[PDB]
Design a protein around this ligand. Structure first.
Ligand SMILES: CCCCCCCC/C=C\CCCCCCCC(=O)OC[C@H](COP(=O)(O)OCC[N+](C)(C)C)OC(=O)CCCCCCC/C=C\CCCCCCCC
Ligand SMILES: CCCCCCCC/C=C\CCCCCCCC(=O)OC[C@H](COP(=O)(O)OCC[N+](C)(C)C)OC(=O)CCCCCCC/C=C\CCCCCCCC
Ligand SMILES: CCCCCCCC/C=C\CCCCCCCC(=O)OC[C@H](COP(=O)(O)OCC[N+](C)(C)C)OC(=O)CCCCCCC/C=C\CCCCCCCC
Ligand SMILES: CCCCCCCC/C=C\CCCCCCCC(=O)OC[C@H](COP(=O)(O)OCC[N+](C)(C)C)OC(=O)CCCCCCC/C=C\CCCCCCCC
Ligand SMILES: CCCCCCCC/C=C\CCCCCCCC(=O)OC[C@H](COP(=O)(O)OCC[N+](C)(C)C)OC(=O)CCCCCCC/C=C\CCCCCCCC
Ligand SMILES: CCCCCCCC/C=C\CCCCCCCC(=O)OC[C@H](COP(=O)(O)OCC[N+](C)(C)C)OC(=O)CCCCCCC/C=C\CCCCCCCC
Ligand SMILES: CCCCCCCC/C=C\CCCCCCCC(=O)OC[C@H](COP(=O)(O)OCC[N+](C)(C)C)OC(=O)CCCCCCC/C=C\CCCCCCCC
Ligand SMILES: CCCCCCCC/C=C\CCCCCCCC(=O)OC[C@H](COP(=O)(O)OCC[N+](C)(C)C)OC(=O)CCCCCCC/C=C\CCCCCCCC
Ligand SMILES: CCCCCCCC/C=C\CCCCCCCC(=O)OC[C@H](COP(=O)(O)OCC[N+](C)(C)C)OC(=O)CCCCCCC/C=C\CCCCCCCC
Ligand SMILES: CCCCCCCC/C=C\CCCCCCCC(=O)OC[C@H](COP(=O)(O)OC[C@H](N)C(=O)O)OC(=O)CCCCCCC/C=C\CCCCCCCC
Ligand SMILES: CCCCCCCC/C=C\CCCCCCCC(=O)OC[C@H](COP(=O)(O)OC[C@H](N)C(=O)O)OC(=O)CCCCCCC/C=C\CCCCCCCC
Lengths: 198, 198
């Protein structure tokens, strides 16, 4: 209802906004023209000077790159030779170590793995006997616990049924007046709330 | 009474649960006793075949570990010498390489950085003229911007007050009646809320 009056004010607001979108926006364009006018001079001088300076800058930089690339080439070429000779030497040095140390490592592995064979074989076998006893214990206690679990489950089931029987009946018996009182409560509330929505 | 009678149903469950928990803990303990009994004899054998047999295990591994370390050290001495000798050659080669490389790098820098000095100087100096041109435009357009924006600001403020005073009165003429109505609705709603479950 009052929303119509308030929206009318919004209409005045829109009108007042449009008034600003007139002279102000036009002046904004004029201002932008001023900006672009100055920027035209700036851009012109900038572009022209950039192109004029970019030439000696890039060309002289290219010279730097030449001295650097050619210089580095004349550095990497001999360095590569030395590095390759040093690397091949390193490879030889390493290879002359990898052979004896390899033989050693292989023999070490033999003496270790073979030892492990004769150390883990009895170990696992011992574990088999131990795990057998462990399993047997788990069976002895397991079979017993199975009976215990079943027995206690029966007792707990009985304690559940002896509870469920009266609990369900009492819950239902109480749910009757409860649901009805709740119904009445809601019926009254809903009837009062509708008066607020009307 | 709901939370009272229902609680009794839980209490009777807890009490009878304890009646089962009693034997449960005893039987669990009994089974745990048998479990620990087996594990006791087990640990007696386990730790025995583990410790008494770990001696020959470690004694075996120690022999190998000793020879491994000894052979390793026996290799380390000449191998380190080889590496050091090779590294000495490589390092010495690098020493005689870093000398011309560094010297030429320094000389190249005389045609790099030094040449850039005579380039960056005029460029930055000219940049000062460019900055002046830009600054002048930014001063002209800036001063205009300030003027234009100020003029627009005043027009914004004048139209703003038209939407700050008459519009606020319109809002006040809405807030007041609306608050009265809302209060009536709230007064009844809050009152009806406590008229069902309290
Ligand atoms: C002497 C002279 C000195 C002074 C001059 C030097 C000044 C430097 C030069 C220029 C200034 C650039 C500023 C203007 C902005 C450009 C706006 C524009 O015109 O824009 C459109 C372009 C379109 O692309 P194009 O096809 O024309 O260009 C590809 C080129 N081709 C066709 C030509 C070969 O858009 C692009 O250039 C942008 C591409 C959009 C890609 C978005 C995906 C980004 C992904 C990940 C974000 C990574 C963040 C990483 C940073 C690290 C943070 C820790
Ligand atoms: C600064 C001076 C300059 C010196 C620069 C040297 C740069 C080296 C340059 C190029 C490397 C070659 C590229 C290798 C790319 C393979 C990637 C890959 O797919 O790779 C996994 C495979 C799997 O193996 P595979 O046998 O099943 O496959 C055999 C398969 N097929 C057919 C490829 C042989 O690997 C392979 O192929 C083999 C990879 C393993 C290589 C083992 C030999 C190592 C040599 C010496 C010992 C050095 C120890 C030094 C490090 C010490 C650290 C403390
Ligand atoms: C429906 C099934 C539910 C389970 C219950 C079984 C049935 C009921 C039977 C007996 C209950 C008797 C009363 C137990 C004593 C209660 C002590 C207590 O006040 O407790 C509540 C506290 C709560 O923390 P707070 O906020 O006070 O502390 C905050 C700490 N501040 C201040 C430092 C930051 O909790 C504590 O104290 C820590 C926990 C103490 C509760 C122990 C109950 C154990 C029951 C069954 C497990 C059976 C094990 C037997 C099997 C053997 C296996 C080898
Ligand atoms: C079926 C096996 C039952 C366990 C079930 C889980 C399976 C994982 C298996 C074995 C690990 C055993 C874990 C027992 C450790 C108890 C941890 C615990 O709950 O710690 C709290 C209690 C209560 O005191 P508090 O925190 O208030 O006081 C200290 C004060 N503070 C907190 C405030 C600053 O502290 C104490 O109990 C203090 C003494 C803790 C004893 C640590 C040494 C345990 C060593 C061996 C356990 C042997 C199991 C063998 C059974 C064979 C089964 C076949
Ligand atoms: C089949 C065989 C049959 C069964 C036979 C039964 C035999 C059982 C076998 C062995 C018995 C072991 C029990 C020993 C108990 C005491 C250990 C101990 O003496 O304990 C204390 C130490 C102290 O150390 P401290 O710094 O205090 O002393 C600084 C001291 N300084 C200078 C001297 C060295 O502590 C340490 O030795 C612990 C420090 C190292 C722990 C680092 C933890 C790192 C964190 C996470 C690991 C994550 C792995 C992720 C896996 C994912 C895979 C996907
Ligand atoms: C030609 C192109 C035109 C560009 C203009 C020319 C400018 C070049 C002029 C001079 C060289 C300086 C530039 C190098 C980078 C700066 C490193 C730096 O900031 O250094 C000083 C810092 C001092 O820290 P603080 O301990 O006093 O502060 C601790 C406490 N706080 C941080 C709170 C104050 O460190 C030290 O003095 C410790 C030593 C670290 C030295 C690093 C220099 C490395 C050299 C070159 C870069 C890598 C090139 C690699 C390419 C390879 C090609 C083969
Ligand atoms: C293929 C790839 C293509 C790339 C092409 C390369 C073209 C190069 C083009 C143009 C370069 C012209 C540079 C003009 C030379 C003068 C620079 C300048 O005016 O130099 C003096 C300033 C003043 O020192 P301050 O008192 O302000 O600092 C206090 C520092 N405190 C806290 C450590 C004590 O020093 C500074 O601005 C520097 C100290 C502040 C640290 C800034 C971050 C540096 C980062 C990495 C290391 C690089 C250093 C390179 C030199 C950069 C210069 C901008
Ligand atoms: C295009 C034509 C359409 C029509 C437009 C009509 C709009 C009306 C236009 C202009 C008239 C109002 C302009 C005057 C504004 C003030 C500017 C100013 O004097 O500023 C600086 C002050 C200084 O405070 P300080 O920080 O130094 O002191 C911190 C204090 N300590 C240190 C002391 C404790 O700051 C302040 O007064 C802080 C004020 C913050 C006010 C923010 C409100 C902005 C309004 C709208 C933005 C809408 C964005 C819409 C989303 C679009 C997404 C595409
Ligand atoms: C079937 C139906 C069932 C029937 C049952 C009945 C309904 C039961 C309903 C709710 C459960 C109880 C909770 C409500 C109790 C009121 C809490 C409250 O309100 O206590 C007031 C405090 C105010 O501050 P203070 O006096 O404690 O501090 C003093 C600071 N000194 C010292 C600087 C001066 O409140 C605060 O602290 C926090 C502010 C909370 C915001 C309140 C709204 C404010 C209005 C506009 C601001 C916009 C909020 C926008 C967020 C969206 C909300 C939908
Ligand atoms: C006092 C009692 C108090 C008890 C309070 C209990 C609490 C209840 C709380 C919540 C219940 C509401 C639960 C709402 C669950 C929302 C379920 C949902 O997402 O439904 C889908 C619709 C979708 O609408 P859209 O159909 O227009 O479809 C396009 C869609 N978005 C698309 O992209 O394709 O979205 C919509 O609901 C919008 C369409 C609405 C149609 C209007 C239908 C009109 C419905 C009712 C009008 C009755 C008034 C008649 C008198 C009018 C007078 C003129
Ligand atoms: C026609 C309809 C007209 C609508 C009219 C509405 C009018 C409503 C009337 C009154 C509103 C009341 C407005 C009250 C504003 C007061 C803001 C303020 O400074 O509050 C003070 C507090 C506390 O400061 P203290 O210095 O006391 O800090 C406590 C101290 N450090 C301590 O440890 O004890 O600061 C804080 O804790 C932070 C609070 C920040 C507030 C968030 C402010 C959020 C602001 C803006 C959000 C941007 C939203 C833009 C939405 C646009 C889309 C449409």
């Amino acid at each position: 209802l009052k929303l119509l009056d308030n929206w009318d004010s919004v209409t005045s607001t829109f009108s007042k906004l449009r008034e600003q979108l007139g002279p102000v926006t036009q002046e904004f364009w004029d201002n932008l023209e001023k900006e672009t006018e100055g920027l035209r001079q700036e851009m012109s001088k900038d572009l022209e000077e950039v192109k004029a300076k970019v030439q000696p800058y890039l060309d002289d930089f290219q010279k730097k790159w030449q001295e650097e690339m050619e210089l580095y080439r004349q550095k990497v070429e001999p360095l590569r030779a030395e590095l390759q000779e040093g690397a091949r030497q390193k490879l030889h040095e390493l290879q002359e170590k990898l052979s004896p140390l390899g033989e050693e490592m292989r023999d070490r592995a033999r003496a270790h793995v073979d030892a492990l064979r004769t150390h883990l074989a009895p170990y696992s076998d011992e574990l088999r006997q131990r795990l057998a006893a462990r399993l047997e214990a788990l069976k002895e206690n397991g079979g017993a616990r199975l009976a215990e679990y079943h027995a206690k489950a029966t007792e707990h089931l009985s304690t559940l049924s002896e509870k469920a029987k009266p609990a369900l009946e009492d819950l239902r018996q109480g749910l009757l007046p409860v649901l009805e009182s709740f119904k009445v409560s809601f019926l009254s509330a809903l009837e009062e709330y509708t008066k607020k929505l009307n």
